[PDB]
Design a binder for this molecule. Structure first.
Ligand SMILES: Nc1ncnc2c1ncn2[C@@H]1O[C@H](COP(=O)(O)OP(=O)(O)OP(=O)(O)O)[C@@H](O)[C@H]1O
Ligand SMILES: Nc1ncnc2c1ncn2[C@@H]1O[C@H](COP(=O)(O)OP(=O)(O)OP(=O)(O)O)[C@@H](O)[C@H]1O
Ligand SMILES: [Mg+2]
Lengths: 359, 333
């Protein structure tokens, strides 16, 4: 039952001795009492971890670059970092799990780029959303004495990937509930995200340590003034600047319009949207740095186009140009009309920065 | 156990207890080192200038040389992040000819991880101190308590700080009295080492039992020495890059100190050197002469053209302005 896996995964020596002692204990145990049950659960958890199997590391720079570039446009820094990672891994023959954090305004694409990075690196992807924790139990687990004892989510992630050296995407670091007594997950993350302590994670449910030095931890936060200094010191932060209007237009025309059209039932059949319409929607409706509300606006426009196509059942193709844009996405809401045609004495125009952008 | 059968759970409880008792190194100790120069050498090949800690270890060896008993004190380290207050532990254990065990106390908030539970429970296990002793299979080990400040002072269902204070008692340490192993165990030989950042969090009764050594950060000159001696060769090795080619000049490291790294630790410096050599390796891969030069005049192409120099500074002081000094994390101001 348990022999084939432990044969095929090449487990380290210490865990091998622990497993041998465990089966020696089980040989003298019977199903009558709960000791056999807890021992069987312990052995199942021990065997679930992919102790000595990794993935096929990426070796081709161009194909990895093309995999990265087919889903995101402007993240030159992240793509360059991944290319450098691949280049370093090629010259050694081995890989090291570096810790990297992404910071930027919402909608820039911090969470979505993780799947593309994992696919380019040929690493199995697991996303761990940690915004709402108040206790360390989800990180370090619970001792097997307790009935409600489950390993930490890192061990469960390693089991789910069924292969060591995964990519673990930690979705929120800013939202981490610091609280007080009854638990502090921040120090648990310090233990997890230490560049030199990854070899001795030492989960509570599994007294044997596990190796995390190969895991490519990817974090994601919106601000940088909430994270404790010890946690921030062990993290390599990459800033994600918000997209420019021209960059937003290119992102739209290259990824959002085809995707929204494909998912609206009008895929490459009837409806197209002009560049002037995109520029107007950028200037008068979506002045932010992200591309979330722009995506919502495009999806609404294409949904209305699909409804019109269905109900109506002129011209061969329907145009959503700037002139008729207000009848699809409503009246403009970000018109700039508080200016002065001729500034009177005492008034001076200044500049400001907000989360939306320039003001 | 001689009058027990595998049918009932009494046999299982007794065999588990016997295995735990026989696994513990009740009487065997480690062989203490008596060579002060050898210990100094083996301490100086991993860290550059942590003079106070090295002197403390040398004094420990010297005082152990004058007796036969290897008394284990409670040394406690406090300093800014990235000063090597955790990486020293392994080298210290190697110098003391002891076995090293690390015990992270970052998120642990239950006394069951320190004292364990009674044998009455189905899956009771001893605390991490007894498990550390079992793993080392020797007395007087080096147990490194990795986080003293970040315990939370205990919430409900346990107060781990009080239990740790019970463990770290300089005088009444010979009777730890584990809850699972319900007889006293001699912890007076174990060497305990902290890893802490702020001294204002530890409770006074716990802080009074620990000998605190202040681990002040590194000066820029010490930073360049640490870089060129340990970080630049290691970062270069960690990306291939061996055979008589690209390296970082001394002026490049000086400019990195002056314009990029003004902290007290050497972690951001490690990041900058790692990214420099990472970009160098990427260039080497792309180009498949093999010599690349990195200096001051082309340093803001690898760690980023952005810098960290303003210096404030009026060219000439007008009447009314006075230049005082202020203390900051980034050196001074
Ligand atoms: N460069 C880009 N190319 C294509 N699509 C993009 C790009 N940047 C963002 N998007 C899209 O915009 C949306 C942003 O969602 P995503 O969760 O990735 O953002 P985020 O900044 O990580 O979010 P949050 O901070 O709320 O967690 C997604 O639909 C994503 O596909
Ligand atoms: N004085 C020093 N000489 C040589 N290397 C050092 C020195 N101080 C730190 N380092 C190196 O810096 C890196 C980080 O050190 P380490 O992880 O021990 O930090 P720390 O001070 O324990 O951190 P924290 O306070 O955040 O827990 C390691 O590679 C270590 O070898
Ligand atoms: Mg799509």
């Amino acid at each position: 039952t348990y022999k084939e896996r432990i044969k095929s995964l090449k487990l380290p020596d210490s865990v091998q001795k622990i497993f041998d002692d465990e089966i020696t204990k089980l040989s003298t145990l019977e199903t009558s009492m709960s000791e056999f049950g807890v021992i069987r659960n312990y052995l199942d958890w021990l065997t679930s971890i992919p102790w000595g199997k990794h993935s096929k590391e990426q070796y081709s720079i161009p194909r990895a670059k093309k995999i990265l570039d087919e889903d995101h446009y402007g993240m030159v820094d992240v793509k360059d970092r991944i290319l450098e990672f691949i280049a370093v891994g090629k010259l050694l023959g081995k890989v090291d799990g570096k810790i990297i954090c992404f910071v930027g305004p919402p909608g820039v694409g911090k969470t979505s780029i993780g799947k593309s990075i994992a696919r380019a690196l040929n690493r199995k992807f697991f996303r761990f959303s940690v915004g709402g924790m108040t206790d360390v139990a989800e990180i370090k687990g619970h001792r097997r004495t307790y009935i409600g004892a489950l390993p930490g989510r890192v061990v469960q992630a390693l089991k789910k990937c069924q292969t060591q050296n995964p990519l673990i995407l930690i979705d929120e670091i800013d939202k981490i509930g610091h609280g007080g007594i009854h638990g502090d997950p921040s120090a648990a993350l310090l233990e997890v995200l230490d560049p030199e302590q990854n070899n001795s994670f030492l989960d509570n449910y599994l007294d044997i340590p596990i190796d995390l030095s190969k895991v490519l931890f990817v974090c994601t936060a919106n601000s940088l003034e909430t994270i404790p200094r010890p946690l921030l010191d062990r993290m390599e932060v990459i800033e994600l600047t918000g997209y420019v209007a021209e960059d937003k237009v290119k992102i739209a025309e290259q990824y959002l319009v085809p995707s929204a059209k494909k998912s609206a039932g009008l895929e490459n059949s009837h409806v197209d949207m002009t560049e002037d319409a995109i520029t107007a929607l950028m200037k008068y409706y979506c002045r932010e740095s992200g591309v979330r509300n722009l995506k919502k606006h495009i999806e609404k426009i294409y949904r209305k186009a699909a409804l019109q196509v269905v109900k109506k059942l002129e011209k061969i193709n329907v145009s959503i140009s700037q002139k008729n844009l207000k009848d699809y996405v409503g009246p403009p809401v970000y018109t700039t009309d508080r200016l002065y045609e001729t500034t009177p004495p005492g008034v001076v125009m200044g500049l400001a920065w907000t989360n939306m952008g320039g003001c």
